[PDB]
Amino acid sequence: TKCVIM
Amino acid sequence: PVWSEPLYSLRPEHARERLQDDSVETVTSIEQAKVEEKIQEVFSSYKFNHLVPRLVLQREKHFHYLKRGLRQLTDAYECLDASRPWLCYWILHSLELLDEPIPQIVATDVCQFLELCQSPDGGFGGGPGQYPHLAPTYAAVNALCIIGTEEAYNVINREKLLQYLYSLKQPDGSFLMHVGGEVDVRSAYCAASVASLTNIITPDLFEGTAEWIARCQNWEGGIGGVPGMEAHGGYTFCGLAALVILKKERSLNLKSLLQWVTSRQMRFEGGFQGRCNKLVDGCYSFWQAGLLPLLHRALHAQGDPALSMSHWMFHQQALQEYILMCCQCPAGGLLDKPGKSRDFYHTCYCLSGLSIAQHFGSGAMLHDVVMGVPENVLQPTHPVYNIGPDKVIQATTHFLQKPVPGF
Amino acid sequence: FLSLDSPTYVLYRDRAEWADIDPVPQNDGPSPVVQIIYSEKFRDVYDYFRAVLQRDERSERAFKLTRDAIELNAANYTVWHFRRVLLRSLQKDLQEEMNYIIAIIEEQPKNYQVWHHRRVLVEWLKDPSQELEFIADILNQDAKNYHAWQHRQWVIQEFRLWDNELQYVDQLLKEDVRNNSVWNQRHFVISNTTGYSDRAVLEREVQYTLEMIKLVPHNESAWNYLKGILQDRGLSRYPNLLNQLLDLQPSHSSPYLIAFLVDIYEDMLENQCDNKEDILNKALELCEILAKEKDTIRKEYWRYIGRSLQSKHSRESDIPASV
Ligand SMILES: CC(C)=CCC/C(C)=C/CC/C(C)=C/COP(=O)(O)OP(=O)(O)O
Ligand SMILES: *C/C=C(\C)CC/C=C(\C)CCC=C(C)C
Ligand SMILES: [Zn+2]
């Protein structure tokens, strides 16, 4: 996936 | 002795820490086993190569990666086009940890860029022209504080910032991430962080916030995104940290929280997982392990007599071994786990976690544990803000000179 | 119309129907930091997005442009906001929009903006009829997707769709009894329906958990659930639990069983149990076995528990210094 925090 | 293996992960007994699936295979066990096997190879590589292991933090390599990234990134980073202040923060913090100075050319350019991201009505957006959001607002403030110049501090429009925070505040004590956006514990932490650092905290700003956060702690002991959700390290960190800022850690059942976080360290890999029965990941070296320093300060504040005076309640050695042996990219940069590609987010959090694992502090008491070559030691990081403790003090002191917006 | 991946996809600066608009390049400043070397497609779409956003052009073409801006970076919340403005202004069909959001989520399920958008659509439409099935499909690809479970809890709670959830929970627990998200959901359903105070429910829950523990002794989730549903009332409040766990000791031990035992002793000691000392020593012995052999990764925690118990429950703990 990509960035999961925001 | 001579037969004594100083590295915990390489000891013969360590093999007993491998997963026991009870002969009942499920997706969870299968996935966990895959990781352990891959990590067992890393551990055994020295043995099969017939070389004595030397754990070296590839500083020079990490520095090049960071130094260039602070200036230019490939299109691989298009997914982070709405998170540029985070790129500034992650990189500057990594450099700060590695004790690399920030040239004034860079510092001044970061400042000017961050002000282009600042909204006319408070808060920072993910890039120039983007609407403000609490995540990049948190990042921008942290980044300006790491720089810590009069210029850096001056970029922040405090009155508007306070107005912005109020526009996001909810009746139940929570905050939206941005206008028309989602609500979860990250917002409470982002808000508390920027508000405390800039001294814009009014008596009613965080009304009900501690209670809202306390409602996120669940049956597991950890904290979920919103009330009712599964306990997760990112949210638990946000929750406890925000509560520490608000001086309300006591609202939580610290005992069950402590048992939950300590249980998140993988017995075999040595690193931490994000939630029960999921996989190990380098960034959790900070989100999860960072909780121990916070819990220590909270428990100690309650006069807990059984607290150690030289270590955190987690295996510091094993975490450092996991990071040093499994999370470094040969070309520079750090990562999630062997097989995963490097990125600035994991670079920032693996180093932050490493620093936490190397440094223990409790008032006058101080005790370091630096696995591998002594040059591996990093600068300390504040467990609440994840920026240098000195930057925290400098920033707060500076902002305490100004009155809370409106007086 | 023209998909971002269509072989015949054309840049916006080469489209006649966009000839009137002047694209707005990004304002990065004279000497950029963290400057992304965007591909031509990305930069072209966003320059046009900047243009429409800047002039607040609430048009059909602007609406179509946001789909492309989103595909290029679904995490761009500013684009999602403008798209929501366009949905209301242009009076767009929300079921069509629901169709769109389900496709996007299917391809990028670990994104915050997509789930929030779907939530807004459901709220606007006041229709949850497609939710549980939709979420079930996502959970069928990643049974632990955090956003999916969170959205599911919201739908169920807000619309009171509790009736079939425990059944769903049981189904997933059968597929993977190690799924912590499912155990959390089980707790969510029970807490909000019958609650755990009903003795019949609690008992049923404990029987079930103990049975799962017997089948997969090393599954941490079942152990956590069992502790989680009994710890509030107090572990010592259930005298039979201890004996029963001790019975699983031979053919079902684990650092989990041993740790639980310490949790029972700890509570017993706090509720003035009989043989205070006999109990305290048993506990410290387990803390030592854990820190030294069965659970060394948590040696610091276990040594601390040992010191805490010692500190507050030893025969000397209540004795004045002078004695
Ligand atoms: C201040 C701030 C913005 C903090 C953010 C903290 C943080 C790490 C949040 C991530 C939460 C999340 C949605 C995890 C699920 O991803 P996953 O299923 O891919 O990962 P997992 O299996 O490790 O849980
Ligand atoms: C939360 C942010 C994360 C995980 C970083 C996202 C960025 C990438 C993934 C970029 C990957 C780049 C290369 C493989 C060259
Ligand atoms: Zn990670």
Coordinates of N, CA and C in Angstrom, one line a residue, chain B residues 8 17 20-29 69-82 84 87-88 91 106 109-110 112-113 116 124-133 136 178-184 186 218-221 223-232 235 253 255-256 258-260 262-267 270 273 275-278 299 304-308 311-318, chain C residues 26-40 42-43 46 50 53 72-73 75-79 81-82 84-85 110 112-113 116 119-120 142 144-147 149-151 153 157 174-181 183-185 187-188 213 215-222 224-229 231-232 253 255-256 259-260 263 266 270 293-309 311:
Chain B
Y8 N 21.5 -11.6 21.9 CA 20.3 -12.3 22.3 C 19.6 -13.1 21.2
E17 N 12.0 -19.5 20.8 CA 11.0 -18.4 20.7 C 10.2 -18.5 19.3
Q20 N 4.6 -21.4 17.7 CA 4.1 -22.8 17.9 C 2.6 -22.6 17.5
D21 N 2.3 -23.2 16.3 CA 1.0 -23.1 15.7 C 0.0 -24.1 16.2
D22 N 0.4 -25.0 17.2 CA -0.5 -26.0 17.7 C -1.0 -26.9 16.6
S23 N -0.4 -26.9 15.5 CA -0.8 -27.7 14.3 C -2.2 -27.3 13.7
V24 N -2.6 -26.0 14.1 CA -3.8 -25.5 13.6 C -3.3 -24.3 12.7
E25 N -3.2 -24.5 11.4 CA -2.8 -23.4 10.6 C -3.9 -22.5 10.2
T26 N -3.7 -21.2 10.3 CA -4.6 -20.2 9.9 C -3.8 -19.1 9.2
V27 N -4.5 -18.2 8.5 CA -3.8 -17.1 7.8 C -2.8 -16.3 8.8
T28 N -3.2 -16.1 10.0 CA -2.4 -15.4 10.9 C -1.1 -16.2 11.2
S29 N -1.2 -17.4 11.5 CA 0.0 -18.3 11.8 C 0.9 -18.4 10.6
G69 N 17.0 13.7 0.2 CA 15.6 13.8 0.3 C 15.0 15.1 0.8
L70 N 15.8 15.7 1.7 CA 15.3 17.0 2.3 C 15.2 18.1 1.2
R71 N 15.8 17.8 0.0 CA 15.8 18.7 -1.1 C 14.9 18.2 -2.2
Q72 N 15.0 17.0 -2.6 CA 14.3 16.5 -3.7 C 13.9 15.0 -3.6
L73 N 12.7 14.6 -4.1 CA 12.2 13.3 -4.0 C 11.7 12.8 -5.3
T74 N 11.7 11.5 -5.6 CA 11.3 11.0 -6.8 C 9.7 10.9 -6.8
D75 N 9.1 10.5 -8.0 CA 7.7 10.4 -8.1 C 7.1 9.3 -7.3
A76 N 8.0 8.6 -6.6 CA 7.6 7.5 -5.7 C 6.8 8.1 -4.5
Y77 N 7.2 9.4 -4.3 CA 6.6 10.1 -3.2 C 5.4 10.9 -3.5
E78 N 4.7 10.6 -4.7 CA 3.5 11.3 -5.1 C 2.4 11.0 -4.1
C79 N 2.4 9.8 -3.5 CA 1.4 9.4 -2.5 C 1.5 10.2 -1.2
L80 N 2.6 11.0 -1.1 CA 2.8 11.9 0.0 C 2.8 13.4 -0.3
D81 N 2.2 13.7 -1.5 CA 2.1 15.0 -2.0 C 1.2 15.9 -1.0
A82 N 0.4 15.3 -0.2 CA -0.5 16.0 0.7 C 0.1 15.8 2.2
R84 N 3.7 17.0 2.8 CA 5.1 17.5 2.7 C 5.7 18.0 4.1
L87 N 7.3 15.1 5.5 CA 8.6 14.8 4.9 C 9.6 15.7 5.5
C88 N 9.3 17.0 5.8 CA 10.2 17.9 6.4 C 10.6 17.4 7.8
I91 N 12.5 13.8 8.0 CA 13.9 14.0 7.6 C 14.8 14.8 8.6
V106 N 19.4 25.6 4.6 CA 18.3 24.6 4.7 C 17.2 25.1 5.7
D109 N 15.1 27.8 4.3 CA 14.2 27.4 3.2 C 13.1 26.5 3.7
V110 N 13.3 25.7 4.7 CA 12.2 24.9 5.3 C 11.2 25.8 5.9
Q112 N 10.5 29.0 5.1 CA 9.7 29.6 4.0 C 8.7 28.7 3.4
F113 N 9.1 27.4 3.2 CA 8.3 26.5 2.6 C 7.1 26.2 3.5
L116 N 4.4 28.7 3.4 CA 3.6 28.6 2.2 C 2.5 27.6 2.4
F124 N -1.6 24.1 9.2 CA -0.8 23.9 8.0 C -1.5 22.8 7.1
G125 N -1.3 23.0 5.8 CA -1.8 22.0 4.9 C -0.7 21.1 4.5
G126 N -1.0 20.1 3.6 CA 0.0 19.1 3.2 C 0.9 19.7 2.1
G127 N 0.7 20.9 1.6 CA 1.4 21.5 0.6 C 0.9 22.9 0.4
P128 N 1.5 23.7 -0.4 CA 1.0 25.1 -0.6 C -0.3 25.0 -1.4
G129 N -1.3 25.8 -0.9 CA -2.6 25.8 -1.5 C -3.6 24.8 -0.9
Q130 N -3.1 23.8 -0.1 CA -3.9 22.8 0.4 C -4.6 23.3 1.7
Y131 N -5.8 22.7 2.0 CA -6.5 23.1 3.2 C -5.7 22.6 4.4
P132 N -5.8 23.3 5.6 CA -5.1 22.9 6.8 C -5.6 21.5 7.3
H133 N -4.8 20.8 8.0 CA -5.1 19.5 8.5 C -4.3 19.3 9.8
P136 N -0.5 17.4 9.1 CA 0.6 18.2 8.7 C 0.8 19.4 9.6
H178 N -9.7 17.6 10.1 CA -9.7 18.8 9.2 C -11.2 19.0 9.0
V179 N -11.5 20.2 8.5 CA -12.9 20.6 8.2 C -13.6 19.6 7.3
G180 N -14.7 19.0 7.7 CA -15.4 18.0 7.0 C -14.7 16.7 7.0
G181 N -13.7 16.5 7.9 CA -12.9 15.3 8.0 C -13.3 14.3 9.0
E182 N -12.5 13.3 9.2 CA -12.7 12.2 10.1 C -12.2 12.5 11.6
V183 N -12.7 11.8 12.5 CA -12.4 11.9 13.9 C -11.8 10.6 14.4
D184 N -10.7 10.7 15.1 CA -10.1 9.5 15.8 C -9.0 10.1 16.7
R186 N -5.9 10.4 16.8 CA -4.7 11.1 16.3 C -5.0 12.6 16.4
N218 N -9.7 0.0 25.5 CA -10.7 -1.2 25.4 C -10.3 -2.3 26.3
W219 N -11.0 -3.5 26.1 CA -10.8 -4.7 26.9 C -9.4 -5.3 26.8
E220 N -8.6 -4.8 25.8 CA -7.2 -5.3 25.7 C -6.2 -4.6 26.5
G221 N -6.6 -3.4 26.9 CA -5.7 -2.6 27.7 C -5.1 -1.5 26.9
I223 N -5.4 1.2 23.3 CA -6.3 2.2 22.9 C -6.6 2.1 21.4
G224 N -7.8 2.2 21.0 CA -8.2 2.1 19.6 C -8.4 3.5 19.0
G225 N -8.7 3.5 17.7 CA -8.9 4.8 17.0 C -10.1 5.6 17.6
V226 N -11.2 5.0 17.8 CA -12.4 5.6 18.3 C -13.0 4.6 19.3
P227 N -13.8 5.0 20.3 CA -14.4 4.0 21.2 C -15.0 2.8 20.6
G228 N -14.6 1.6 21.1 CA -15.1 0.4 20.5 C -14.1 -0.4 19.6
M229 N -13.2 0.4 19.0 CA -12.2 -0.3 18.1 C -11.0 -1.0 18.8
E230 N -10.4 -1.9 18.0 CA -9.3 -2.7 18.4 C -8.1 -1.9 18.9
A231 N -7.4 -2.3 19.9 CA -6.3 -1.6 20.5 C -5.1 -1.6 19.4
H232 N -4.5 -0.5 19.2 CA -3.5 -0.4 18.2 C -2.4 0.6 18.6
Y235 N -2.5 4.5 17.7 CA -3.6 5.2 18.5 C -3.3 5.2 20.0
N253 N -6.5 3.1 32.7 CA -6.1 1.9 33.5 C -4.7 1.6 33.0
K255 N -2.3 0.1 34.3 CA -1.9 -1.3 34.5 C -2.2 -2.2 33.3
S256 N -3.4 -2.1 32.8 CA -3.8 -3.0 31.7 C -3.1 -2.5 30.4
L258 N -0.1 -1.1 30.3 CA 1.3 -1.6 30.4 C 1.4 -3.1 30.0
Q259 N 0.4 -3.9 30.4 CA 0.5 -5.3 30.1 C 0.3 -5.5 28.6
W260 N -0.6 -4.7 28.0 CA -0.9 -4.8 26.6 C 0.4 -4.4 25.8
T262 N 3.6 -4.2 26.6 CA 4.7 -5.1 26.8 C 4.5 -6.4 26.0
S263 N 3.3 -6.8 25.8 CA 2.9 -8.0 25.1 C 3.0 -7.9 23.6
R264 N 3.2 -6.6 23.1 CA 3.4 -6.3 21.7 C 4.8 -6.6 21.2
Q265 N 5.7 -6.8 22.0 CA 7.1 -7.1 21.6 C 7.2 -8.5 21.1
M266 N 7.6 -8.8 19.9 CA 7.7 -10.2 19.4 C 8.8 -10.9 20.0
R267 N 8.5 -12.1 20.7 CA 9.5 -12.9 21.4 C 10.6 -13.4 20.5
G270 N 12.0 -9.6 18.2 CA 12.5 -8.6 19.0 C 11.9 -7.2 18.8
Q273 N 4.9 -5.3 17.3 CA 3.8 -5.5 16.3 C 2.8 -4.3 16.6
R275 N -0.7 -4.6 16.6 CA -1.8 -5.1 17.3 C -1.6 -6.6 17.5
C276 N -2.3 -7.2 18.4 CA -2.2 -8.6 18.7 C -2.5 -9.5 17.5
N277 N -1.6 -10.4 17.3 CA -1.7 -11.4 16.1 C -1.5 -10.8 14.7
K278 N -0.8 -9.6 14.7 CA -0.4 -9.1 13.4 C 1.1 -9.1 13.3
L299 N 3.7 6.2 36.1 CA 3.7 5.3 37.2 C 4.6 5.9 38.3
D304 N 5.2 5.0 42.3 CA 5.4 3.6 42.2 C 6.8 3.2 42.7
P305 N 6.9 2.4 43.7 CA 8.2 2.0 44.3 C 8.9 0.9 43.6
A306 N 8.2 0.0 42.8 CA 8.8 -1.1 42.1 C 9.4 -0.8 40.8
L307 N 9.4 0.4 40.3 CA 9.9 0.8 39.0 C 11.4 0.7 38.9
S308 N 11.9 0.1 37.9 CA 13.4 0.0 37.6 C 14.0 1.5 37.5
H311 N 16.3 0.8 33.4 CA 15.7 0.2 32.1 C 14.2 0.5 32.0
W312 N 13.7 0.4 30.8 CA 12.3 0.6 30.4 C 11.7 -0.8 30.5
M313 N 10.4 -0.9 30.6 CA 9.8 -2.2 30.7 C 9.6 -2.9 29.4
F314 N 10.7 -3.0 28.7 CA 10.8 -3.8 27.4 C 12.2 -4.2 27.2
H315 N 12.4 -5.2 26.3 CA 13.7 -5.7 26.0 C 14.5 -4.7 25.1
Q316 N 15.2 -3.8 25.7 CA 16.0 -2.8 24.9 C 17.0 -3.4 23.9
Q317 N 17.7 -4.4 24.4 CA 18.7 -5.1 23.6 C 18.1 -5.7 22.4
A318 N 17.0 -6.5 22.6 CA 16.3 -7.2 21.4 C 15.7 -6.2 20.4
Chain C
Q26 N 2.3 24.8 -9.1 CA 2.5 24.8 -7.7 C 3.4 25.8 -7.2
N27 N 3.0 26.5 -6.1 CA 3.8 27.5 -5.5 C 4.8 27.0 -4.5
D28 N 5.9 26.4 -4.9 CA 6.9 25.8 -4.0 C 7.9 26.8 -3.5
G29 N 8.0 28.0 -4.0 CA 9.0 29.0 -3.5 C 10.2 29.0 -4.4
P30 N 11.1 30.0 -4.3 CA 12.3 30.1 -5.0 C 13.3 29.0 -4.9
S31 N 13.4 28.4 -3.7 CA 14.4 27.3 -3.4 C 13.7 26.2 -2.6
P32 N 13.0 25.3 -3.3 CA 12.2 24.2 -2.7 C 12.9 23.2 -1.8
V33 N 12.1 22.7 -0.8 CA 12.6 21.6 0.1 C 11.6 20.5 -0.1
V34 N 12.0 19.3 0.1 CA 11.2 18.1 -0.2 C 10.3 18.2 -1.4
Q35 N 10.9 18.7 -2.5 CA 10.3 18.9 -3.8 C 10.2 17.5 -4.5
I36 N 9.0 17.2 -4.8 CA 8.7 15.9 -5.5 C 8.8 16.1 -7.0
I37 N 9.6 15.3 -7.7 CA 9.7 15.3 -9.1 C 8.5 14.6 -9.7
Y38 N 7.4 15.2 -9.8 CA 6.2 14.6 -10.3 C 6.3 14.2 -11.7
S39 N 5.6 13.1 -12.1 CA 5.5 12.7 -13.5 C 4.7 13.8 -14.2
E40 N 4.7 13.7 -15.5 CA 4.0 14.7 -16.3 C 2.5 14.6 -16.1
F42 N 0.8 13.5 -13.4 CA 0.4 14.0 -12.1 C 0.4 15.5 -12.1
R43 N 1.5 16.1 -12.5 CA 1.7 17.6 -12.5 C 0.6 18.2 -13.4
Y46 N -2.9 18.0 -11.5 CA -2.9 18.9 -10.3 C -2.8 20.4 -10.7
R50 N -5.5 22.9 -9.4 CA -5.2 24.2 -8.7 C -6.0 25.3 -9.4
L53 N -9.9 24.9 -8.5 CA -10.1 25.1 -7.0 C -9.9 26.6 -6.7
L72 N -4.7 9.8 -8.8 CA -3.2 10.0 -8.7 C -2.8 10.1 -7.3
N73 N -3.6 10.6 -6.4 CA -3.3 10.6 -4.9 C -4.5 10.7 -4.1
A75 N -4.9 10.2 -1.2 CA -4.7 10.7 0.1 C -4.9 12.2 0.2
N76 N -5.0 12.9 -1.0 CA -5.2 14.3 -1.0 C -6.6 14.7 -0.5
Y77 N -6.7 15.0 0.8 CA -7.9 15.4 1.4 C -8.6 16.7 0.8
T78 N -7.8 17.6 0.3 CA -8.3 18.9 -0.3 C -9.1 18.5 -1.5
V79 N -8.7 17.6 -2.3 CA -9.4 17.2 -3.5 C -10.7 16.5 -3.1
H81 N -12.5 17.2 -0.5 CA -13.4 18.2 0.0 C -14.0 18.9 -1.1
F82 N -13.2 19.3 -2.1 CA -13.8 20.0 -3.3 C -14.8 19.1 -4.0
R84 N -16.7 16.9 -2.6 CA -17.9 16.9 -1.9 C -18.7 18.2 -2.1
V85 N -18.0 19.3 -2.3 CA -18.6 20.6 -2.6 C -19.3 20.4 -3.9
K110 N -6.7 0.8 2.4 CA -6.0 1.3 3.6 C -5.8 2.8 3.5
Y112 N -7.6 6.6 4.6 CA -8.5 7.3 5.4 C -9.7 8.1 4.7
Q113 N -9.3 8.8 3.7 CA -10.2 9.6 2.9 C -11.4 8.9 2.2
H116 N -13.9 7.8 4.9 CA -14.7 8.9 5.4 C -15.7 9.4 4.4
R119 N -18.7 7.2 4.4 CA -19.5 7.5 5.6 C -20.3 8.7 5.3
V120 N -19.8 9.8 4.7 CA -20.5 11.0 4.4 C -21.7 10.7 3.4
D142 N -9.0 -8.7 3.3 CA -8.1 -8.4 4.4 C -9.0 -8.4 5.6
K144 N -8.5 -8.1 8.5 CA -8.0 -7.3 9.6 C -8.0 -5.8 9.2
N145 N -8.5 -5.4 8.1 CA -8.5 -4.0 7.7 C -9.2 -3.2 8.7
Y146 N -8.4 -2.4 9.4 CA -8.8 -1.5 10.5 C -10.0 -0.5 10.1
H147 N -9.9 0.1 9.0 CA -10.9 1.1 8.5 C -12.3 0.4 8.3
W149 N -13.3 -2.4 9.7 CA -14.0 -2.8 11.0 C -14.5 -1.6 11.7
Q150 N -13.8 -0.4 11.6 CA -14.3 0.8 12.2 C -15.6 1.3 11.6
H151 N -15.6 1.2 10.2 CA -16.8 1.6 9.5 C -18.0 0.7 9.8
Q153 N -18.4 -0.9 12.6 CA -18.9 -0.6 14.0 C -19.8 0.6 13.9
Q157 N -23.8 0.5 14.9 CA -24.2 1.3 16.0 C -25.2 2.3 15.6
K174 N -14.2 -18.8 12.9 CA -14.0 -20.2 12.4 C -12.9 -20.2 11.3
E175 N -13.0 -19.2 10.5 CA -12.0 -19.0 9.4 C -10.6 -18.8 10.0
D176 N -10.5 -18.0 11.0 CA -9.2 -17.7 11.6 C -9.4 -17.2 13.1
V177 N -9.3 -18.2 13.9 CA -9.5 -18.0 15.4 C -8.5 -17.1 16.0
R178 N -7.4 -16.8 15.2 CA -6.4 -15.9 15.6 C -6.6 -14.5 15.2
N179 N -7.7 -14.2 14.6 CA -8.0 -12.8 14.2 C -8.5 -11.9 15.3
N180 N -7.6 -11.1 15.8 CA -7.8 -10.2 16.9 C -9.0 -9.2 16.6
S181 N -9.1 -8.8 15.4 CA -10.1 -7.8 15.0 C -11.5 -8.5 15.2
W183 N -12.2 -10.9 17.4 CA -12.4 -11.0 18.9 C -12.9 -9.7 19.4
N184 N -12.2 -8.6 18.9 CA -12.6 -7.3 19.3 C -14.1 -7.0 18.9
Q185 N -14.5 -7.4 17.7 CA -15.8 -7.2 17.3 C -16.8 -8.0 18.1
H187 N -16.5 -8.7 21.2 CA -16.7 -7.9 22.4 C -17.6 -6.7 22.2
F188 N -17.5 -6.1 21.0 CA -18.3 -4.9 20.7 C -19.8 -5.3 20.6
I213 N -9.1 -22.0 23.6 CA -7.8 -22.1 24.2 C -7.4 -23.5 24.1
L215 N -8.2 -25.8 22.0 CA -7.8 -26.1 20.6 C -6.5 -25.5 20.1
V216 N -6.3 -24.3 20.5 CA -5.1 -23.5 20.1 C -4.5 -22.8 21.3
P217 N -3.9 -23.6 22.2 CA -3.3 -23.1 23.4 C -2.4 -21.8 23.3
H218 N -1.8 -21.7 22.2 CA -0.9 -20.5 21.9 C -1.5 -19.3 21.2
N219 N -2.8 -19.3 21.0 CA -3.4 -18.2 20.4 C -3.6 -17.1 21.5
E220 N -2.8 -16.1 21.4 CA -2.9 -15.0 22.4 C -4.3 -14.3 22.4
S221 N -5.0 -14.2 21.3 CA -6.3 -13.5 21.3 C -7.3 -14.0 22.3
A222 N -7.5 -15.4 22.3 CA -8.5 -16.0 23.2 C -8.1 -15.7 24.6
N224 N -6.4 -13.1 25.8 CA -6.7 -11.7 26.0 C -8.2 -11.5 26.2
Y225 N -9.0 -12.1 25.4 CA -10.5 -12.0 25.5 C -10.9 -12.4 26.9
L226 N -10.5 -13.6 27.3 CA -10.8 -14.2 28.6 C -10.5 -13.3 29.7
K227 N -9.2 -12.8 29.7 CA -8.8 -11.8 30.7 C -9.7 -10.6 30.6
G228 N -9.8 -10.0 29.4 CA -10.6 -8.8 29.2 C -12.0 -8.9 29.7
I229 N -12.7 -10.0 29.6 CA -14.1 -10.0 30.0 C -14.3 -10.4 31.5
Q231 N -11.6 -9.5 34.0 CA -10.7 -8.6 34.8 C -11.4 -7.5 35.5
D232 N -12.4 -6.9 34.9 CA -13.2 -5.8 35.4 C -13.9 -6.1 36.7
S253 N 0.1 -25.9 28.4 CA 0.8 -24.7 29.0 C 1.3 -23.7 27.9
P255 N 3.3 -19.4 27.9 CA 3.7 -18.3 28.8 C 2.4 -17.5 29.0
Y256 N 1.3 -17.8 28.2 CA 0.0 -17.1 28.3 C -0.7 -17.7 29.6
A259 N 1.1 -16.6 32.7 CA 1.0 -15.2 32.9 C -0.4 -14.9 33.5
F260 N -1.4 -15.6 33.1 CA -2.8 -15.5 33.5 C -2.8 -15.9 35.0
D263 N -1.9 -13.2 37.1 CA -2.9 -12.2 37.2 C -4.0 -12.6 38.2
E266 N -2.3 -12.1 41.7 CA -2.2 -10.7 41.9 C -3.5 -10.1 42.5
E270 N -4.9 -8.9 46.3 CA -5.5 -7.5 46.5 C -6.8 -7.6 47.2
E293 N 12.9 -17.9 32.1 CA 12.8 -19.0 31.0 C 11.6 -18.9 30.0
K294 N 10.4 -18.9 30.5 CA 9.2 -19.0 29.7 C 8.8 -17.7 28.9
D295 N 9.3 -16.6 29.3 CA 8.9 -15.3 28.6 C 10.0 -14.2 28.9
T296 N 11.2 -14.5 28.5 CA 12.3 -13.6 28.7 C 12.3 -12.2 28.0
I297 N 11.6 -12.2 26.9 CA 11.4 -10.9 26.1 C 10.8 -9.8 27.0
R298 N 10.0 -10.3 28.0 CA 9.3 -9.4 28.9 C 9.9 -9.5 30.3
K299 N 11.2 -9.9 30.4 CA 11.9 -10.0 31.7 C 11.8 -8.7 32.5
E300 N 11.9 -7.6 31.9 CA 11.8 -6.3 32.7 C 10.4 -6.1 33.3
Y301 N 9.3 -6.5 32.5 CA 8.0 -6.4 33.0 C 7.8 -7.4 34.2
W302 N 8.1 -8.6 33.9 CA 7.9 -9.7 34.9 C 8.7 -9.4 36.2
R303 N 9.9 -8.9 36.1 CA 10.7 -8.6 37.3 C 10.0 -7.4 38.1
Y304 N 9.4 -6.5 37.4 CA 8.7 -5.4 38.0 C 7.4 -5.9 38.7
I305 N 6.7 -6.8 38.1 CA 5.5 -7.4 38.7 C 5.9 -8.1 40.0
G306 N 7.0 -8.8 39.9 CA 7.6 -9.5 41.1 C 7.9 -8.5 42.2
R307 N 8.5 -7.4 41.9 CA 8.8 -6.4 42.9 C 7.6 -5.7 43.4
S308 N 6.6 -5.5 42.6 CA 5.3 -4.8 43.0 C 4.6 -5.7 44.0
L309 N 4.5 -7.0 43.7 CA 3.8 -8.0 44.6 C 4.5 -8.1 45.9
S311 N 6.6 -5.9 47.2 CA 6.4 -4.6 47.8 C 5.1 -4.4 48.6

